Paper text:
The [name] and FlgK junction proteins that are located between the FlgE hook and the flagellin filament are indispensable for the formation of the flagellum because both [name]-deficient bacteria and FlgK-deficient bacteria lack functional flagella and are immotile. To investigate the role of [name] in hook-filament assembly, we have determined the crystal structures of [name] from gram-positive Bacillus cereus (bcFlgL) and gram-negative [name] (xcFlgL). The bcFlgL and xcFlgL structures revealed that the D1 domain of [name] forms a four-segment structure, irrespective of the bacterial species.
The bcFlgL structure was refined to 2.2 Å resolution. xcFlgL was crystallized in two different crystal forms, and we obtained two xcFlgL structures (xcFlgLC2 structure in space group C2 at 1.9 Å resolution; xcFlgLH3 structure in space group H3 at 2.2 Å resolution; xcFlgL structure refers to xcFlgLC2 unless specified). The truncated bcFlgL and xcFlgL proteins adopt one-domain (D1) and two-domain (D1-D2) structures, respectively. xcFlgL contains an additional domain, D2, compared to bcFlgL. In the xcFlgL structure, the α3 helix is split into the α3a and α3b helices, between which the D2 domain is inserted, extending from the middle of the S3 segment. The D2 domain of xcFlgL forms a β-sandwich structure, which consists of a β5-β12-β7-β8-β9 sheet and a β6-β11-β10 sheet. In the xcFlgL structure, the β-sandwich fold of the D2 domain is affixed to the upper part of the helical structure of the D1 domain. The β5 and β6 strands of the D2 domain, which constitute one edge of the β-sandwich, interact with the N-terminal region of the α4a helix from the D1 domain. Notably, the D1-D2 interdomain orientation and interface are essentially identical in the two crystal structures of xcFlgL (xcFlgLC2 and xcFlgLH3) despite different crystal contacts, suggesting that the D1-D2 orientation would not change in different environments and would be recapitulated both in solution and in the flagellum.
Author numbering: 54 to 362
The structure:
């Protein structure tokens, strides 16, 4: 009897504890989702290349405030002051500022909480899985205008492309040998193909594709390869720093817009990760309800057994 009663007491406490934490997580991430939606909107506006330096600086200012509030939300606690987004190292704040970057000092472990016999409900997400471990580009491939380009070539978009072959995961460089001519080269600087450039026409090779507009100069290049991972705070920081740049020449404007288009892509990926994280938090709420109703059936059996004896 004593072992059975301890079990149900434990189930009741476990259910209440995980229910609280999951509720505070939904609140925190709802708030973070609103901020993330405003960051997304500002990223879209940042890609309006007609904005004044003054308009850009306003957007940069707001993005900085949003980034800071996101850090505070990432350090949310549960009302025993245990951190929500630190995994199992929930005693010290998991998101810490170092040299203009945000570091994650929590762990990767998501706790499973027994709410009924053999029936587990996940506790809150480790912060790494909301804020840090975010793929760039389109999630699969990423591409950038080279930082040293002297022309006005915009990288408008890119993707995997089943038409030019099955992409092997490798990196490639599209390099202009003339105003209207490019070469595509692999990791080893070896020639894969050449092509004629026309504004907005797809450049296709090696299982990947890109679209370029404007006027690339001879020697300008564009790199394309596997996506990396970048935390959302760095993505916002890099967008802010780009917006604050001077754009006196067509070349400088093109450099900023390339950087801002890339930031926006990476932001789109961070937005998708937040959607998913938020959604995951609701998925097991019916099991908590079921655990709670089973516990109500236990009240009825306890009360009748108590009355009998």
């Amino acid at each position: 009897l004593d072992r059975a009663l301890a079990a149900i007491t434990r189930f009741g406490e476990n259910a209440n504890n995980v229910q609280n934490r999951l509720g505070l997580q939904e609140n925190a991430l709802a708030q973070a989702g609103d901020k993330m939606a405003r960051v997304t909107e500002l990223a879209v506006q940042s890609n309006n290349s007609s904005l004044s330096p003054d308009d850009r600086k306003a957007i940069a200012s707001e993005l900085t405030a949003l980034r800071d509030s996101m850090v505070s939300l990432a350090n949310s606690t549960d009302g025993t002051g245990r951190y929500l987004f630190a995994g199992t190292s929930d005693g010290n704040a998991p998101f810490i500022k170092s040299n203009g970057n945000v570091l994650y000092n929590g762990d990767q472990t998501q706790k499973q909480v027994e709410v009924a016999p053999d029936t587990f409900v996940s506790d809150t997400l480790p912060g790494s899985e909301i804020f840090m471990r975010i793929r760039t580009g389109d999630g699969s491939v990423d591409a950038h205008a080279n930082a040293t380009n002297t022309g006005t070539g915009l990288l408008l978009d890119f993707s995997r492309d089943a038409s030019s072959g099955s992409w092997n995961g490798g990196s490639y460089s599209v390099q202009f040998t003339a105003a209207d001519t490019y070469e595509v080269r692999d990791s080893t600087n070896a020639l894969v193909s050449t092509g004629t450039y026309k504004d907005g026409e797809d450049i296709n090779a090696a299982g990947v594709r890109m679209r370029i507009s404007g006027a690339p100069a001879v020697g300008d290049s564009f790199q394309i390869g596997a996506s990396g991972t970048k935390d959302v705070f760095s993505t916002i920081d890099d967008m802010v720093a780009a917006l604050n740049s001077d754009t006196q020449t067509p070349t400088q404007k093109a450099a900023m817009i390339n950087t801002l288009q890339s930031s926006m892509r990476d932001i789109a990926q961070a937005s998708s990760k937040m959607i998913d994280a938020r959604a995951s938090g609701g998925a097991q709420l019916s099991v908590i309800d079921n655990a709670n109703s089973l516990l109500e059936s236990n009240e009825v059996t306890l009360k009748t057994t108590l009355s009998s004896i």
